Amino acid sequence: GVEIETISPGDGRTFPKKGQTVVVHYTGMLQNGKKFDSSRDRNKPFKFRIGKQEVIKGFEEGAAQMSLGQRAKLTITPDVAYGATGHPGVIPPNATLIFDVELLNLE
C-alpha cells in the first residue's frame, strides 16, 4: 500500500473526490532517492483524475488522502506500483517507490 509522511500541512477541508481532477507537482524516485520522473523538472504541474487509473495505484491512493496545499512523501510498495514486472528500463522488478507530492489544486 501507501504510507504518507507529511512535509507541509494542507487545509484539512478540501480532499480529492472520486473522478476529480487533481493538480500536483511531484518527483518520482526509487527507494534510494534516484529520480525517475519529475513534473518540477518540466515546470508544468501534472493533472490526473482520482480513481481513473491514470497513474499508479499508490500515487492515486496517496493523493486521495491529502488535502489541498499539503506536501507529502509517499512510500509506495510494488503491489500498488509496478509489481513484479517493473517498468523495463525505468523501474526494476519489485520496486518500492517514493513520491514527493504537493497538492496544488482540485478542479
Numbering used by the authors: 1 to 107
From the paper:
The human genome encodes two homologous 12 kDa FK506-binding proteins, FKBP12 and FKBP12.6, which differ at 18 residue positions. The primary known physiological function of FKBP12.6 involves its role in regulating the RyR2 isoform of ryanodine receptor Ca2+ channels in cardiac muscle, pancreatic β islets and the central nervous system. Similarly, both FKBP12 and FKBP12.6 can bind the immunosuppressant rapamycin to form an inhibitory ternary complex with the protein kinase mTOR (mammalian target of rapamycin), which plays a major role in regulating cell growth and cancer progression. X-ray structures at 1.70 and 1.90 Å resolution from P21 and P3121 crystal forms are reported for an unligated cysteine-free variant of FKBP12.6 which exhibit a notable diversity of conformations.
The two non-equivalent monomers in the asymmetric unit of the P3121 crystal form differ from each other by only 0.35 Å r.m.s.d. for all of the backbone heavy atoms. As illustrated by the P3121 crystal form of the unligated protein, the interactions surrounding residue 76 are largely similar to those for the rapamycin-inhibited wild-type FKBP12.6, with the maximum backbone perturbation occurring at Val80 Cα, which is displaced by less than 0.7 Å owing to steric inter­action with Cγ2 of the substituted isoleucine side chain. Despite the close alignment of the backbone heavy atoms for the two non-equivalent monomers in the asymmetric unit of the P3121 crystal form (0.35 Å r.m.s.d.), the orientation of the aromatic ring of Phe59 at the base of the active-site cleft is strikingly different. In molecule B the phenylalanine ring superimposes upon that seen in the rapamycin-inhibited FKBP12.6, which in turn is closely similar to the orientation of the Trp59 ring in the numerous X-ray structures of the wild-type FKBP12 protein. The reoriented aromatic ring of Phe59 in the presently reported structure of FKBP12.6 likewise partially occludes the active-site binding pocket.
